[PDB]
Amino acid sequence: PGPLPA
Amino acid sequence: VNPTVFFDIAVDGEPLGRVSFELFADKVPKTAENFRALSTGEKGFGYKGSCFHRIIPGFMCQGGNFTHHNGTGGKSIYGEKFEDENFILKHTGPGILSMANAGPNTNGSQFFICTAKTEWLDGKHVVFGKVKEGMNIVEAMERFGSRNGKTSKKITIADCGQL
Numbered sequence A: 001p002g003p004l005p006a
Numbered sequence B: 001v002n003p004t005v006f007f008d009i010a011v012d013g014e015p016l017g018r019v020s021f022e023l024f025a026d027k028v029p030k031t032a033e034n035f036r037a038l039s040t041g042e043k044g045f046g047y048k049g050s051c052f053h054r055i056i057p058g059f060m061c062q063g064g065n066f067t068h069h070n071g072t073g074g075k076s077i078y079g080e081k082f083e084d085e086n087f088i089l090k091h092t093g094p095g096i097l098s099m100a101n102a103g104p105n106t107n108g109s110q111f112f113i114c115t116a117k118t119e120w121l122d123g124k125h126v127v128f129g130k131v132k133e134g135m136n137i138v139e140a141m142e143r144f145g146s147r148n149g150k151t152s153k154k155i156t157i158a159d160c161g162q163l
Helices: B029-040 B135-142
Strands: B004-011 B014-023 B054-056 B060-063 B096-099 B111-114 B127-133 B155-162
Touching: B004 B029, B004 B135, B014 B029, B014 B135, B029 B127, B029 B155, B060 B135, B060 B155, B127 B135
Parallel strands: none
Antiparallel strands: B004 B014, B004 B155, B014 B127, B054 B060, B060 B111, B096 B111, B096 B127
16 A cells, blocks of 8 residues: 555 | 665656665664665665556655565565664655555565655654655656556666665
């Protein structure tokens, strides 16, 4: 998923 | 002195340009060295030929996948994964270079370049460098991203190494 956007 | 590495970025093979990074070996030596060695390919694997597979405008550009025996998701130079070294440095703005992970102590090869301040990642992702030259190229890469991160063209690391 990659770093979270929040 | 801190090492500098470069990526020559291509868009479906057409050269876009060079991004150079300072790696903060003075603060996160183990993490800096991983990225440095993956950038030169000196261990027999690394970033050359890999893609930025997740690019989210206004957020970050992520890459660092490459093929190895137990995976296609990359690995560190210390075996498959390694611990979060420290969280001294913060995601303070555009150009920050930081490690992707799957939770605490799961650093491999994947990394991202922030195109904005991303303070909610502080203490979760190890910051280990910053863009030195070529932020314009990172901005260009960003335009091939999308909200869910899928890229509209293949953004690849045509060449990379140490300056």
